[PDB]
Design an enzyme around this catalytic site. Structure first.
Site, PDB file in Angstrom:
ATOM      1  N   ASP A 127      -7.158  -2.393   3.053  1.00 32.90           N
ATOM      2  CA  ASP A 127      -6.215  -3.458   2.733  1.00 32.90           C
ATOM      3  C   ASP A 127      -6.662  -4.806   3.307  1.00 32.90           C
ATOM      4  O   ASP A 127      -5.990  -5.826   3.125  1.00 32.90           O
ATOM      5  CB  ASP A 127      -4.813  -3.097   3.232  1.00 32.90           C
ATOM      6  CG  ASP A 127      -4.296  -1.822   2.604  1.00 32.90           C
ATOM      7  OD1 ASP A 127      -4.772  -1.495   1.502  1.00 32.90           O
ATOM      8  OD2 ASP A 127      -3.438  -1.139   3.209  1.00 32.90           O
ATOM      9  N   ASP A 169      -2.125  -1.409   5.960  1.00 24.52           N
ATOM     10  CA  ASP A 169      -2.344  -0.685   7.199  1.00 24.52           C
ATOM     11  C   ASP A 169      -3.839  -0.339   7.343  1.00 24.52           C
ATOM     12  O   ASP A 169      -4.469  -0.654   8.361  1.00 24.52           O
ATOM     13  CB  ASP A 169      -1.466   0.582   7.263  1.00 24.52           C
ATOM     14  CG  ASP A 169      -1.971   1.698   6.367  1.00 24.52           C
ATOM     15  OD1 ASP A 169      -2.504   1.388   5.275  1.00 24.52           O
ATOM     16  OD2 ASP A 169      -1.885   2.875   6.766  1.00 24.52           O
ATOM     17  N   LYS A 224     -14.153   7.382  -1.953  1.00 20.53           N
ATOM     18  CA  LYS A 224     -13.075   8.338  -2.214  1.00 20.53           C
ATOM     19  C   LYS A 224     -13.592   9.770  -2.180  1.00 20.53           C
ATOM     20  O   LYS A 224     -13.105  10.643  -2.896  1.00 20.53           O
ATOM     21  CB  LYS A 224     -12.394   8.034  -3.547  1.00 20.53           C
ATOM     22  CG  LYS A 224     -12.170   6.538  -3.757  1.00 20.53           C
ATOM     23  CD  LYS A 224     -11.224   6.222  -4.883  1.00 20.53           C
ATOM     24  CE  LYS A 224      -9.888   5.706  -4.374  1.00 20.53           C
ATOM     25  NZ  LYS A 224      -9.964   4.380  -3.704  1.00 20.53           N
ATOM     26  N   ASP A 261       0.838  -1.187   0.000  1.00 27.50           N
ATOM     27  CA  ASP A 261       0.000   0.000   0.000  1.00 27.50           C
ATOM     28  C   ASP A 261       0.870   1.233   0.000  1.00 27.50           C
ATOM     29  O   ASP A 261       2.069   1.123   0.256  1.00 27.50           O
ATOM     30  CB  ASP A 261      -0.918  -0.002   1.200  1.00 27.50           C
ATOM     31  CG  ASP A 261      -1.883   1.125   1.178  1.00 27.50           C
ATOM     32  OD1 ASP A 261      -2.464   1.386   0.120  1.00 27.50           O
ATOM     33  OD2 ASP A 261      -2.033   1.784   2.223  1.00 27.50           O
TER      34      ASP A 261
HETATM   35  N1  LIG Z   1     -11.005  11.621   5.247  1.00 29.75           N
HETATM   36  C1  LIG Z   1     -11.182  11.746   3.903  1.00 29.75           C
HETATM   37  N2  LIG Z   1     -12.219  12.451   3.422  1.00 29.75           N
HETATM   38  C2  LIG Z   1     -12.412  12.602   2.100  1.00 29.75           C
HETATM   39  N3  LIG Z   1     -11.605  12.077   1.155  1.00 29.75           N
HETATM   40  C3  LIG Z   1     -10.520  11.346   1.481  1.00 29.75           C
HETATM   41  C4  LIG Z   1     -10.253  11.127   2.903  1.00 29.75           C
HETATM   42  N4  LIG Z   1      -9.146  10.370   2.959  1.00 29.75           N
HETATM   43  C5  LIG Z   1      -8.751  10.123   1.695  1.00 29.75           C
HETATM   44  N5  LIG Z   1      -9.580  10.690   0.797  1.00 29.75           N
HETATM   45  C6  LIG Z   1      -9.418  10.620  -0.704  1.00 29.75           C
HETATM   46  O1  LIG Z   1      -9.815   9.363  -1.291  1.00 29.75           O
HETATM   47  C7  LIG Z   1      -8.703   8.646  -1.829  1.00 29.75           C
HETATM   48  C8  LIG Z   1      -8.878   7.173  -1.515  1.00 29.75           C
HETATM   49  O2  LIG Z   1      -7.842   6.694  -0.700  1.00 29.75           O
HETATM   50  P1  LIG Z   1      -7.847   5.141  -0.299  1.00 29.75           P
HETATM   51  O3  LIG Z   1      -8.784   4.415  -1.226  1.00 29.75           O
HETATM   52  O4  LIG Z   1      -8.058   4.872   1.161  1.00 29.75           O
HETATM   53  O5  LIG Z   1      -6.278   4.858  -0.408  1.00 29.75           O
HETATM   54  P2  LIG Z   1      -5.248   5.939   0.214  1.00 29.75           P
HETATM   55  O6  LIG Z   1      -5.615   5.965   1.677  1.00 29.75           O
HETATM   56  O7  LIG Z   1      -3.869   5.377   0.015  1.00 29.75           O
HETATM   57  O8  LIG Z   1      -5.482   7.249  -0.487  1.00 29.75           O
HETATM   58  C9  LIG Z   1      -7.496   9.336  -1.214  1.00 29.75           C
HETATM   59  O9  LIG Z   1      -6.243   9.176  -1.914  1.00 29.75           O
HETATM   60  C10 LIG Z   1      -7.971  10.776  -1.114  1.00 29.75           C
HETATM   61  O10 LIG Z   1      -8.040  11.335  -2.418  1.00 29.75           O
HETATM   62  F1  ALF Z   2      -2.569   3.783  -0.466  1.00 29.63           F
HETATM   63 AL1  ALF Z   2      -3.699   3.271   0.821  1.00 29.63          AL
HETATM   64  F2  ALF Z   2      -4.799   2.655   2.100  1.00 29.63           F
HETATM   65  F3  ALF Z   2      -2.758   4.107   2.100  1.00 29.63           F
HETATM   66  F4  ALF Z   2      -4.629   2.401  -0.412  1.00 29.63           F
HETATM   67 MG   LIG Z   3      -3.085   2.739   3.669  1.00 30.87          MG
END
Ligand SMILES: Nc1ncnc2c1ncn2[C@@H]1O[C@H](COP(=O)(O)OP(=O)(O)O)[C@@H](O)[C@H]1O
Ligand code: ALF
Ligand SMILES: [Mg+2]
Ligand SMILES: CC[C@H]1/C=C/C=C/C[C@@H](C)[C@H](O)[C@@](C)(O)C(=O)[C@@H](C)[C@H](O)[C@@H](C)C(=O)[C@@H](C)[C@H](O)[C@@H](C)/C=C/C(=O)O[C@@H]2[C@H](C)[C@H](CC1)O[C@]1(CC[C@H](C)[C@H](C[C@@H](C)O)O1)[C@H]2C
Ligand SMILES: CCCCCCCCCCCCCCCCCC(=O)OC[C@H](COP(=O)([O-])OCC[N+](C)(C)C)OC(=O)CCCCCCCCCCCCCCCCC
Ligand SMILES: CCCCCCCCCCCCCCCCCC(=O)OC[C@H](COP(=O)([O-])OCC[N+](C)(C)C)OC(=O)CCCCCCCCCCCCCCCCC
Ligand SMILES: CCCCCCCCCCCCCCCCCC(=O)OC[C@H](COP(=O)([O-])OCC[N+](C)(C)C)OC(=O)CCCCCCCCCCCCCCCCC
Ligand SMILES: CCCCCCCCCCCCCCCCCC(=O)OC[C@H](COP(=O)([O-])OCC[N+](C)(C)C)OC(=O)CCCCCCCCCCCCCCCCC
Ligand SMILES: CCCCCCCCCCCCCCCCCC(=O)OC[C@H](COP(=O)([O-])OCC[N+](C)(C)C)OC(=O)CCCCCCCCCCCCCCCCC
Ligand SMILES: CC(C)CCC[C@@H](C)[C@H]1CC[C@H]2[C@@H]3CC=C4C[C@@H](O)CC[C@]4(C)[C@H]3CC[C@]12C
Ligand SMILES: CC(C)CCC[C@@H](C)[C@H]1CC[C@H]2[C@@H]3CC=C4C[C@@H](O)CC[C@]4(C)[C@H]3CC[C@]12C
Ligand SMILES: CC(C)CCC[C@@H](C)[C@H]1CC[C@H]2[C@@H]3CC=C4C[C@@H](O)CC[C@]4(C)[C@H]3CC[C@]12C
Ligand SMILES: CC(=O)N[C@@H]1[C@@H](O)[C@H](O)[C@@H](CO)O[C@H]1O
Ligand SMILES: [Mg+2]
Ligand code: NA
Ligand code: NA
Ligand code: NA
Ligand code: NA
EC number: 7.2.2.13
Lengths: 303, 34, 994
Positions: free
Chosen positions: C692, C688, C458, C347
């Site tokens: 995942d 994490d 997202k 990740d």
């Molecule tokens: N608390 C939040 N509220 C709204 N949008 C978020 C939040 N956290 C992340 N996002 C958005 O949504 C995307 C989805 O992330 P995710 O699917 O969990 O993988 P990662 O955590 O690595 O980004 C993020 O990269 C960011 O653009």
């Molecule tokens: F890149 Al992530 F949860 F940190 F998909």
């Molecule tokens: Mg992560």
């Protein structure tokens, strides 16, 4: 990756299947050959190293004398009737019940016939009285085939005869015939007056190695037999003039000293244990080896 | 001691036990090397 | 059919009580919680929230398990028949031997020594592994007295209210007070792991069925909820079940599977020989009692008693090594699996990255703006007053859902601890330090509805009440994936005034992302919509399960980008990993730009390989014109993966070297992992987040970050890096690679001995010569050289080629394969056997019987009655006299085997390097060598050893007889391994590298 490996196979038919290329569950005739060859040259040359290293050891032994003797060190006393289980059991009246004992003892004594000791080159005349160790020389090929101390059937009193085909041997009251184990380069030493025997020292302290056959051990035992020792010079033992022995390489037809014991007891229909013993300084005994320098033959004249 | 023919197993045996003590002891001293 | 009836028996609740009822029962204010005082009170009254320890096993009974451990038990059988046959001996003969008496004594003794050894080792494993069972203090989040704070789950008491989110474990039995879109995993209670929703509603008279009770020991997959503790500790429904809430489980690792397969067949052939020899012996006029002992001697000899103990040691070793690296490993056998890793699917955020964000740039009013990244001591680099920055900061404030914990408002904003998204924390801390209080801001725009963020949507979204005057009475606010956010907009806010989203601004938007994302900053998009009054009156009933309000035509306000630096070790981590043959694939839910950037920064992608988009850009030609194969690396956006057939997904895996999967849904994380599995690889996932979860489960090995992890994902995994140290993965993988090598080395060595242990009795018949080696001496071979030296290999250190050679093929490098039988039986096993034979012929020929003379003597040599046995020199041997030499031969054969077993135990120390590279640093191997040989001297040069075991002294010349062969072994393997060091792919390697 783009590399094609692993076994993503879906045919247990591949055990013999080959329509693709490889066969017998194996590889191709080029590697199925190649590794075969490996083992061919591997085991091949490997067998060569066993061969080679055996060869090196071989030329560390003289074909005249053993490099070691301490394991046959004191010799043992062996009879010529092929002891079944040290037991000579038969029915005196019936010929069949001992015909086995006879063919064995007869076959051995055909090495000692007079017609067998013909030529004077191989066979030498050692006196009709037991002498001192006729030392042929040094255990080499220096002097060639050493002379053989002859031994006549007649010395063995009463157990020689002269029949037609098979020797007519003792049916009523058997003939045990005792012999000494051939040790290359051995010289028997007869007892003096110190370490005396279980019996009175029968004559010839100089040149005879005594053999005496009593009952079962020496303590409280059912002693029921009539001993009678027959031999060269009429002495109950071994003529020293025959020793030392110079091996199969230097004495191919060497006849060793024999000495019989016609057991003419006074008790039929029963089994009795009798222990022979060669006494001396060069003769030893073992509580485990029931044959080392001694004898435990149990005979039954059950008629 | 020496006479006719035989092999002195007394020394061969004690010589081999001396070795068996070397191997044994050095064997332990290595596995306990401080 | 189940037992759920025998579970609903002892059940009584308050899922029926109204909210006011609930309140008066427990006393807690349903929204401010209970006072820390009242908390502390109850805690002393009710004791900590923790089930009381369930005793699995006792000491001594575990001792006996080991003592009868598979092979150990077979030893008893033989040992039994040894004492047995000896009793019979004192009835067929007057004062018989002492062999079988002593044999029963030694055999049994070994079982004991072995058994109690392994026990103590395996005890040391389950001492060290349990030293970690209480290192992860399961936290719970409670709202005691207005504020909310995270404490040890043990400090939670009956009554206070709990707040669980996505991927939080449920800390006690709760009655749900409130919930937005919460879904719980009742799998641990009800089998089906399908998410069940939890609302506050009362839905079924049965406490189990109903939706307003969340149970202890489950977790909530996603959504969010508050509830009130109605059952602490052993009182919870899941404490009440007297089965096993935490401890013993299932699963059978591949290495375990390999071993069990090998033991099954090796034990088979080992009994096939024993009874085939047994009947052969009978035919060969063997005594009846000594036939069975010969059988039982054979069995033990072709059966590898070491293996088990060896395996035990290796686990105990690896358990000690991971421990010193803060790596919680749930099953020690899987550390092996971790070594067989071909593909690591990791990740991004909170894995490769530190997950310690801090806002750096904003995009709004078509400009980029800088905000003081470290040691701010100020606010941003623009006027705090701009109409646009205002509306931006408001939703980055409002749509935020993070808050500082309890008792913090007295120290600097940077110092106090937070709760929630690392992205949101950064959002918070930012505007808190340079604009106003989000606490007061959020309270001014009292929020009506919200759809809390989750890794698959997202975006986060809420409607808040507006108290301004230009207020249209309802303010919609959302953030998320900037691309996604912008795609729902219509207007953009510029210097206060909103005007349609034209094409130019869209393209400026994109360059911004390329710019900001390109630094490796995480970018978040922000918009809002002023909900129009006539369509949305005062008491409007916003619905959030059928979307009663606009999701489209929003007004885009800006982007905020935050710095999220790669974790310390990760570069050399993925470095070394790649250098170990491990393909490292990034699988993230973040944007392709931000993804790629970090990919290069850690070296998932080496700057020198190109992406079709790179290539295309270079030639100024369409991207869809480029030929995909001209690209070594790629950046695959998950909105396109959604349209991949497997063959397509397979293809991108199979033909690209450095792969990065961007904006992936949680399931897409699985598909990928699933894809890499399908190719015939062994994948490792490191995560994490709760997103995942599924990938970490599917994976051949889950690795969670033990800190920034979530409850659920830590639970999925097989490894939890308590220090969040990503380099533990390496340490781990090397460790894994090592268990496999050492275990294989052991089987290599232990198998040589069988051929010489059995070739004599075979040759005894085929050549009718005096038995070169017998039953007594066979045991000695075995329990002397095939024991301690076999175990010693487990203690044997690592080679040097391991983290430089490709990961093993599970369908080729089996723990035991034909190549390993090729050596231990066909090559080295053979040599050792010749060594014994050689010395056998020397001893006989030196004592009077030349080898050529030896053929045929069998019948009469063994015969108890012919005492005229004539050697080559014409000497006459008595029975016991030639037996002295034969049995002195036996002693030597054994002793010769010991000698060659040195060289074998040296070459089976290394599989690739030379023994001069490897070096004697395994003291336990040395220790084995000496004791093994002291024993050999002892068994021959001790008084009565020939009266008790038919073992007699050797003459000094005898020892060296086997020396030639021993050396032949050392050098053969040495040169063999040399050819392979200098000829990879070579025929030598592709046939003899077991
Ligand atoms: N608390 C939040 N509220 C709204 N949008 C978020 C939040 N956290 C992340 N996002 C958005 O949504 C995307 C989805 O992330 P995710 O699917 O969990 O993988 P990662 O955590 O690595 O980004 C993020 O990269 C960011 O653009
Ligand atoms: F890149 Al992530 F949860 F940190 F998909
Ligand atoms: Mg992560
Ligand atoms: C570390 C703890 C050990 C457990 C000890 C339990 C002792 C109690 C005692 C009463 C036993 O159950 C036993 C005597 O009945 C017993 O072992 C029998 C099941 C067994 O069938 C016995 C009668 C035999 O005859 C046995 C010698 C088999 O013939 C033989 C083919 C299997 C030997 C073997 O080493 O198996 C191991 C071992 C049992 C081990 C046992 C391990 O089981 C097997 C178990 C499962 C895994 C896959 C292991 C691999 C590795 C982790 O050991 O392989 C497993 C591969
Ligand atoms: C006729 C045939 C007779 C043959 C009889 C042979 C009997 C052999 C039986 C099985 C032995 C299996 C033991 C595995 C090896 C353990 C190695 C280890 O490092 O131990 C420490 C480990 C400790 O944990 P550790 O391994 O993590 O710590 C190691 C630290 N250093 C490096 C300093 C040692 O375990 C033990 O404490 C358990 C004790 C068991 C020891 C068994 C001794 C064998 C007995 C006699 C064999 C022959 C030699 C005589 C010398 C006796 C003195 C030692
Ligand atoms: C009274 C009785 C007589 C006493 C004399 C004693 C002599 C006996 C000597 C040893 C015989 C034992 C045979 C070897 C055991 C190998 C089994 C194994 O696990 O292999 C599986 C494996 C299976 O692996 P796999 O499960 O991964 O399957 C692979 C195939 N795919 C990928 C397609 C799934 O088989 C092999 O591939 C190896 C091939 C070996 C070649 C031929 C084997 C047999 C040939 C010799 C046997 C002769 C019989 C002697 C008995 C006589 C009795 C009178
Ligand atoms: C009286 C005669 C006496 C003869 C004495 C013979 C002694 C040799 C003993 C047998 C050796 C094999 C031991 C088995 C060990 C099993 C280990 C295991 O994990 O298996 C997995 C492994 C798995 O490895 P693998 O995974 O690589 O196998 C599959 C891979 N492909 C598909 C490529 C094949 O299995 C083995 O390789 C088994 C070894 C078989 C080798 C064949 C040996 C031939 C036997 C001897 C000669 C036969 C004579 C017949 C004529 C009879 C007439 C008298
Ligand atoms: C590239 C690396 C190479 C290394 C460097 C080169 C080293 C020199 C080469 C050879 C060394 C010596 C061995 C070859 C000689 C063969 C002997 C022979 O013919 O055997 C039959 C002979 C037979 O001789 P025999 O024909 O007279 O028979 C009677 C002997 N008895 C009664 C004892 C049987 O066997 C023996 O007598 C040998 C055993 C004696 C006891 C101990 C021997 C040890 C000596 C070797 C040590 C090597 C020196 C190095 C220093 C070590 C110190 C830690
Ligand atoms: C009576 C005979 C007694 C012989 C006993 C002596 C032991 C050796 C026996 C057989 C010879 C085989 C030895 C080859 C070992 C390979 C080591 C190697 O890889 O070197 C590079 C290693 C590794 O260097 P590296 O760490 O930089 O890594 C590179 C590795 N390669 C080059 C493979 C890519 O260098 C060393 O560590 C030096 C030490 C090894 C030197 C060997 C000492 C004695 C061996 C030779 C003497 C015998 C003569 C040969 C004839 C045999 C026929 C009888
Ligand atoms: C470099 C290589 C080629 C040298 C070869 C030396 C070989 C031939 C040497 C090394 C050790 C030697 C063996 C060492 C000890 C004995 C015991 C002795 O009672 C018989 C000879 C024998 C068996 C030796 C035969 C030759 C021997 C095998
Ligand atoms: C290179 C290393 C591994 C070689 C080790 C060789 C050792 C073990 C050899 C060399 C000399 C040998 C000793 C040489 C002489 C004797 C006297 C004999 O009565 C008992 C055996 C004994 C004590 C031998 C035991 C093995 C021995 C100590
Ligand atoms: C007691 C004596 C006669 C037994 C001799 C056993 C020999 C013939 C056995 C032992 C180990 C066997 C080898 C074991 C493993 C392989 C790999 C396989 O791909 C080819 C067959 C081959 C090479 C076997 C050929 C026969 C072999 C070398
Ligand atoms: C049957 C037979 O010939 N018996 C003889 C006997 O004639 C002889 O007097 C005696 C001499 O010891 O030996 C016996
Ligand atoms: Mg996340
Ligand atoms: Na064994
Ligand atoms: Na799994
Ligand atoms: Na071995
Ligand atoms: Na073995």
């Amino acid at each position: 990756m783009a590399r094609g490996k692993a076994k993503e196979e879906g045919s247990w038919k591949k055990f013999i299947w080959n329509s693709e290329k490889k066969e017998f569950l194996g590889r191709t005739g080029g590697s199925w050959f190649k590794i075969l060859l490996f083992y061919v040259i591997f085991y091949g040359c490997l067998a060569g190293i066993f061969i080679g290293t055996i060869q090196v050891m071989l030329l560390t032994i003289s074909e005249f004398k053993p490099t070691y003797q301490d394991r046959v060190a004191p010799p043992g006393l062996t009879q010529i009737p092929q002891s079944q289980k040290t037991e000579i059991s038969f029915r005196p009246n019936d010929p069949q019940s001992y015909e086995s004992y006879v063919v064995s003892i007869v076959r051995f004594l055909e090495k000692y016939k007079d017609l067998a000791q013909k030529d004077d080159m191989i066979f030498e005349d050692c006196g009709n009285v037991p002498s001192e160790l006729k030392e042929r020389g040094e255990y080499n090929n220096e002097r060639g085939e050493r002379k053989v101390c002859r031994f006549r059937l007649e010395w063995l009193g009463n157990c020689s005869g002269l029949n037609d085909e098979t020797y007519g041997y003792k049916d009523g009251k058997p003939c045990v015939i005792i012999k000494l184990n051939r040790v290359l380069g051995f010289k028997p030493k007869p007892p003096k007056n110190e370490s005396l025997e279980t019996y009175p020292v029968m004559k010839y302290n100089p040149y005879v190695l005594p053999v005496h056959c009593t009952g079962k051990r020496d303590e409280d035992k059912e002693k029921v037999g009539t001993m009678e020792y027959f031999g060269l010079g009429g002495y109950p033992g071994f003529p020293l003039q025959y020793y030392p022995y110079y091996g199969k390489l230097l004495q191919p037809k060497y006849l060793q000293p024999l000495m019989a014991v016609q057991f003419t007891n006074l008790t039929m229909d029963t089994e009795i244990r009798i222990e022979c013993k060669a006494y001396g300084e060069n003769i030893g005994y073992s509580e485990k080896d029931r044959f080392q320098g001694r004898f435990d033959v149990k005979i039954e004249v059950k008629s | 001691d020496v006479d006719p023919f035989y092999y002195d197993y007394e020394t061969v045996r004690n010589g081999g036990l001396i070795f068996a003590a070397l191997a044994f002891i050095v064997g332990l001293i290595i596995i306990l090397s401080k | 059919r189940d037992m759920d009836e025998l579970k609903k028996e002892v059940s009584m609740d308050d899922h029926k009580l109204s909210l006011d009822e609930l309140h008066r029962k427990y006393g807690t204010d349903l929204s401010r919680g209970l006072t820390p005082a009242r908390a502390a009170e109850i805690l002393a009254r009710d004791g900590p929230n923790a089930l009381t320890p369930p005793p699995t096993t006792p000491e001594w009974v575990k001792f006996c398990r080991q003592l009868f451990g598979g092979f150990s038990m077979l030893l008893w059988i033989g040992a039994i028949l040894c004492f047995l046959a000896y009793g019979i001996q004192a009835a067929t003969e007057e004062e018989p031997q002492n062999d079988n008496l002593y044999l029963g004594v030694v055999l049994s003794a070994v079982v004991i020594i072995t058994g109690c050894f392994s026990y103590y080792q395996e005890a040391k494993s389950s001492k060290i592994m349990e030293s970690f069972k209480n290192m992860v203090p399961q936290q719970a989040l409670v709202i005691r007295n207005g504020e909310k704070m995270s404490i040890n789950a043990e400090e939670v008491v009956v009554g206070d209210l709990v707040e669980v989110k996505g991927g939080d474990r449920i800390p006690a039995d709760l009655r749900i007070i409130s919930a937005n879109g919460c879904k719980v995993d009742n799998s641990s209670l009800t089998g089906e792991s399908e998410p069940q929703t939890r609302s506050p509603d009362f839905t079924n008279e049965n406490p189990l069925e109903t939706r307003n009770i969340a149970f202890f020991s489950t977790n909530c997959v996603e959504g969010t909820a508050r509830g009130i503790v109605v059952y602490t500790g052993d009182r919870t429904v899941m404490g009440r079940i007297a089965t096993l809430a935490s401890g013993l489980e299932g699963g059978q690792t591949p290495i375990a599977a390999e071993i069990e397969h090998f033991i099954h067949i090796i034990t088979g052939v080992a009994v096939f020989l024993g009874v085939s020899f047994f009947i052969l012996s009978l035919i060969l006029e063997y005594t009846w009692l000594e036939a069975v002992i010969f059988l039982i001697g054979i069995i033990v000899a072709n059966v590898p008693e070491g293996l088990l103990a060896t395996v035990t040691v290796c686990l105990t070793l690896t358990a000690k090594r991971m421990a010193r690296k803060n790596c919680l490993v749930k099953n020690l056998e899987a550390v092996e699996t971790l070594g067989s890793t071909s593909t690591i699917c990791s990740d991004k955020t909170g894995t490769l990255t530190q997950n310690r964000m801090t806002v750096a740039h904003m995009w709004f009013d078509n400009q980029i703006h800088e905000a003081d990244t470290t040691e701010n001591q100020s606010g941003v680099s623009f006027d705090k007053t701009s109409a646009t920055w205002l509306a931006l900061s408001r939703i980055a404030g409002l749509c935020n859902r993070a808050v500082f914990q309890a008792n913090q408002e007295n120290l600097p904003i940077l110092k106090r601890a937070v709760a929630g998204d690392a992205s949101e924390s950064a959002l918070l801390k930012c505007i808190e330090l340079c604009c106003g209080s989000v606490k007061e801001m959020r309270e001014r725009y009292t929020k009506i509805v919200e759809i809390p963020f989750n890794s698959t949507n997202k975006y986060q979204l809420s409607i808040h009440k507006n108290p301004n005057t230009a207020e249209p009475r309802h303010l919609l606010v959302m953030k998320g994936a900037p691309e996604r956010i912008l795609d729902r907009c219509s207007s953009i806010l510029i210097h206060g005034k909103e005007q349609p989203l034209d094409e130019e601004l869209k393209d400026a938007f994109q360059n911004a992302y390329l710019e900001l994302g390109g630094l490796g900053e995480r970018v978040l998009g922000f918009c809002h919509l002023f909900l129009p009054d006539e369509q949305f009156p005062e008491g409007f009933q916003f619905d959030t399960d059928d979307v009663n309000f606009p999701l489209d035509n929003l007004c885009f306000v800006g982007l905020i980008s935050m710095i999220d630096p790669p974790r310390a070790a990760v570069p050399d981590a993925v470095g070394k990993c790649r250098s170990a043959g491990i393909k490292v694939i990034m699988v993230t839910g973040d944007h392709p730009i931000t993804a790629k950037a970090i990919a290069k920064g850690v070296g998932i992608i080496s700057e020198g390989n190109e992406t079709v988009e790179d290539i295309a850009a270079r030639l100024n030609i369409p991207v869809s014109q480029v030929n995909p194969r001209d690209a070594k690396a790629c950046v695959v956006h998950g909105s396109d993966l959604k349209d991949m057939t497997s063959e397509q997904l397979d293809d991108i895996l199979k033909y690209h070297t450095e792969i990065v999967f961007a904006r992936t849904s949680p399931q897409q994380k699985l598909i990928i992992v699933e894809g890499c599995q399908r190719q015939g690889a062994i994948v490792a996932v490191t995560g994490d987040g709760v997103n995942d979860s599924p990938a970490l489960k599917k994976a051949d090995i889950g690795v969670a970050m033990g800190i920034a992890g979530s409850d659920v994902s830590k639970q999925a995994a097989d490894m939890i890096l308590l220090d969040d140290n990503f380099a533990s993965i390496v340490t781990g993988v090397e460790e894994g690679r090592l268990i496999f090598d050492n275990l294989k080395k052991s089987i290599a060595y232990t198998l040589t001995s069988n051929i010489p242990e059995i070739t004599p009795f075979l040759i005894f018949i085929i050549a009718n010569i005096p038995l070169p080696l017998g039953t007594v001496t066979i045991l000695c071979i075995d329990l002397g050289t095939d024991m301690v030296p076999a175990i010693s290999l487990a203690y044997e250190q690592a080679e040097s080629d391991i983290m430089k050679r490709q990961p093993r093929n599970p369908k080729t490098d089996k723990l035991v394969n034909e190549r390993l039988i090729s050596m231990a039986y066909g090559q080295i096993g053979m040599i050792q056997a010749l060594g014994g034979f050689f010395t056998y012929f020397v001893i006989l020929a030196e004592n009077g019987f030349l080898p050529i003379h030896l053929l045929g003597l069998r019948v009469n040599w063994d015969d108890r009655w012919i005492n005229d046995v004539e050697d080559s020199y014409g000497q006459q041997w008595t029975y016991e006299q030639r037996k002295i030499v034969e049995f002195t031969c036996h002693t030597a054969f054994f002793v010769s085997i010991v000698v060659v077993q040195w060289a074998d135990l040296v070459i089976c120390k290394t599989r690739r390097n030379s023994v001069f590279q490897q070096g004697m640093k395994n003291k336990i191997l040395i220790f084995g060598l000496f004791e093994e040989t002291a024993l050999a001297a002892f068994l021959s040069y001790c008084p009565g050893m020939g009266v008790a075991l038919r073992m007699y002294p050797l003459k000094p010349t005898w020892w060296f007889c086997a020396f030639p062969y021993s050396l032949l072994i050392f050098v053969y393997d040495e040169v063999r391994k040399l050819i392979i060091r200098r000829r990879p792919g070579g025929w030598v390697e592709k046939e003899t590298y077991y």
